[PDB]
Amino acid sequence: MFVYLSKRIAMPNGVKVTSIAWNDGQGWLACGGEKGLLKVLKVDGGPQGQRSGGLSSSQTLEGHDTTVDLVTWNQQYCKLTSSDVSGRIIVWVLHKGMWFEEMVNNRNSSRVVDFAWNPSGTKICITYEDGAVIVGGVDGNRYWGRELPYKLAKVCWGADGNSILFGTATGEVYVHDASSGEHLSQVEIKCNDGKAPSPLAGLSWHPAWVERPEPLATLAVCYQSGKLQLMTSIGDETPCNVDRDLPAHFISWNPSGTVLAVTAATPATEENGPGIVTQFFSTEGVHLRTLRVSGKQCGGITWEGGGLRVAIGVDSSVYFANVRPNYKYCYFKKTAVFAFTVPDKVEESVMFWNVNTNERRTKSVRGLQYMNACKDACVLISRPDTTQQQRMIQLVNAIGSPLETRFIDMELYTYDMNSSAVVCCGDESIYIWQFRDPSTAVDALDPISMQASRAESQERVIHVCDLVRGDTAPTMKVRSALTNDLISAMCVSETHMFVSLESGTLHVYQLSPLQLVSKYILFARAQSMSVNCNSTQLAVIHLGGITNVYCIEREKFSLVPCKADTIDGVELKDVWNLRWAVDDPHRFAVMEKTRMLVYNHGVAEEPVQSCANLCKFKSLKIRTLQLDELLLDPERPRKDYIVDFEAQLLRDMRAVLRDGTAKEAYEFAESHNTKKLWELLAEHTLFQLDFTYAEVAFIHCKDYAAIQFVKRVRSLDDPKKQLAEVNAYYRRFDEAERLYKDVDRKDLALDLRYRLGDWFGVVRLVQEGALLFQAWENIGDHYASRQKWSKAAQYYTQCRHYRKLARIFYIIEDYEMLTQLISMGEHDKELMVTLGNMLLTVGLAEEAAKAFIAANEPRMAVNGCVQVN
């Protein structure tokens, strides 16, 4: 998960922010500040509004004589509520697009310290410092009011909606009833020392997993000291309490409930100066990220309704930090793969979506933690039991059929994969599962999956510090030798392996064999690493945020630590995605801030405004996946979320071919000499019926099949058929069948539709004016393989193919038509024997015997009658 600042809005007069609240349903952010400043801005949470910077509305409200202290939202009815130091509470309701008051009250008793809505947005718990609580309805009908004895400071809402959690001024937390409000119980706290009453700063219970079989640790209790305790229930006995050194003032769960955000106003004790530091954790207490900004006073922190932006009130301004959540996804073989959560389950659903055919295969994985892919396979790493430190590593193929599985009982933290191994690193130890012989050439005959199955697995577990050599004995024994330099990042190439340590050292191993061949010294610790196609350059995102592309030289491979040579012109800050061109070692794409840059040889292109996660970079094309939109309808992916960009070289070749001569395109291709450019040139000149440029292009890039295709097209006579064949080559089948019809040749059109294998289209072409029966039989086979027995029976009856039709009828348990089939199959003898055997097995021996005598051999008939008595 990455964070980066992406906007800043200054308050008028420089009024310091004291409260902030962002709506989910529409997008109306609200801010407050002293001298009674209250503002409502509208921001578009869509990616289009993030790229275009959409801030449609900005309205300054009024009605508060002093500082706006608390701002809260209701997302079911989009109803705002604000408070005041003087002791007034005002509700605000939208009339025709603008904001107006609806109720103003002043208790004149104490100072309100909190109020919140239930998940349905039906009750608001206006609570004061004396302990007085008033639960009001949507309209204002006071459900119940009380004067609790202790001094309340923080108030939450139960996830289910029937309990209300209160917090004392001392620091204790109680659970009361929603309706009656009596003292139901007290939460078991253990982060609080109990020596002195520590005030609390965060108390939030996100209801996203109320109906979850094993509810996640969405409860959060935070104290002013900074002790965070994530519980899963009212009285949970084993909270995932994760401590942080920094203090805490405000907390906020994201709308998905999967990330907590805790902000702190750090004073001038540190050398960096005063600032605001926001720590972002997951539900397990894992510290995900931290964003530091300059400032002195913190006003609050809110999440965008999509959970993709955080609005932080820094002094007298508001910062919008875009949040890139860590999406577990991959792309391979024209197949995107992505995981998502369903509120009613514990497992995670991993969709394997083929985007070329829109084919969906969903797999249930329990406790998924990593995903990757290479060539013809994918890797899913999971932790089926949270308590048991057992890691399952499943190698699967494109549609999700499991290929191999391993179980490693050590605590991994980083993972990676290449075409012959799966490498997983913990604190110090490194597990390597080589599932394939790397010397064997991966091709279409022997993909990763087939070679992995046919071959044997070699598992090793080595240490970070020990100098593994070729003659070092492989072992499965992890070593907890106390080394201070823990592993921070890791990466794998097709021929090497790269480990980064916490200090900033970079070990470089080989893979086949496993030798620690080099060491390097980096500027700081690496938090993310990646390696180019031929393992010459290595991109590192450091802990600070600066990305550098070091050079890795086999000549300079020495075991002594030394400085690593970077690449000039590449110094990027706040990078959240990177990809390397799998065919060109120099090109690489970077998603940083809100834009994409396509570097070649170190010099970038013009930035492209995008937020789609990078999926693939190959043949000068860049395929990206808008996962922020795809996860809104995870079960319904749309091809419009796949965005294809091109390199400047590809765009220039497109421009040259569009408005230039063939010779200019030839000169461009010969000057730049890329396979994609030659293929594009050949395609464009084939569509224009000029074959010499296509031939030389298919010669320069190595493609013998395309050379033979071009020669075959040349050897023809009618240009219309040649253009139809060229359209057939490049997956333009409608136009090919049109151009085949236009020469009064339906036979070639139906041959094309049969070779492509859309037997529906073959049916359509045949019906227009044997092969119809063949197409019907193929459709019946397709429907049978998908266990659609009724439709398979339909198409088999239309085909009049009784051998498979009988098996269909046996499957449906429909023996009426099964006994019927004898009359129309009497001319078939083998069918009669099979039918008689089927009815013998099911027990109906009378129709079995008449079927057998239809086969002109009744000994089996009398046998079956005997055996059934």
Partner: protein, 388 residues
Amino acid sequence: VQLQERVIVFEFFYDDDRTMRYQDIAQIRRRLECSLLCVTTGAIIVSNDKRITMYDFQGNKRREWSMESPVQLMKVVGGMEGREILLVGLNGGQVMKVFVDNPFPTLLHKGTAPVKSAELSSSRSRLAVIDSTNTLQVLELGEKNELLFSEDNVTAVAFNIDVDDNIAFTTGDNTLHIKTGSLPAYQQAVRGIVVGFKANHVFNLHYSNMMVLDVPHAHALYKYVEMRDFDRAYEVACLGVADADWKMLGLHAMSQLRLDIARKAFTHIQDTKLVELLKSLELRRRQKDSVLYGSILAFQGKYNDAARQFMKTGCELKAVEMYCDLKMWDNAKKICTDEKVLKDLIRQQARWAEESQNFVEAASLYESCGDYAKAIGMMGQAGQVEKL
């Protein structure tokens, strides 16, 4: 549902809103004692010790069978309405079919140990028997049950409801074997026992947890490709394998001179390069396995191995022309050895250099060839006066 004093028969149905509902359609107010219970379409069946009694939904008895040994297992395996088959296992090792209309069981299997569990195939032409020793035997039913295979320490078994020759059995070491045909078994090492098996799923129960596990059809496809039987490879592939699996299947089918299944394997890939390779191969076939595997590898992208394959058959001319058509004559020169073909190849080099706007190289190639008639014009085009 057998309660403490009644037996309640429910029926499941769907409403207008496509939400499944249950309705209690029968009550039998008879205190029944049995070791096994089986419901059917219209009648229930209870079984205790030796006696199997079949009752109607009101409570009146319909039939009764007395066996030879106490009954250990009883299971309905489906059939026509009112004539549904049963399957009974006895302490004597007898597995028999008890039709609810017949009063006479039919003998299927005679075992040497008490039968703890037994299931019938989807086609009901094969039988799986689990003895008292946790030893499983799968046999082909008939006049004499011919044994197909046997595996020890089996805790549970299931047959594929949708596929005939597909068994899934869980052994005592928490390993779930999945056999298809005569092939070895995919092993997953998952806890609990297998209780169901469809075409693409395995329903494995571990205590109170039901888990659905995907069936790898690629694993059987690999083994079927390895032993060069392709019909079963295609049949397993049709159950759903990845695009690379179809690609590999078609390529291996082509490399074995078996193009009929190759044309069917490349229907599911959507890659026209293999389709034009297929149509070129059939263009040849309408007019040698080591000859055509060279063509397969040439279209794959390994021209050196293709030329080696063309060397294996002893005909070098085809590889020579193949290397000529790639316009890299360095690799074409070593293979070609005929006296005329050196001159032919350098003539082709000269023509290609002429058509590639490389005039000085074309003049040099012509001087190597000795075709001065065109070499004069090519040298004039090149522009070196001294050489002219």
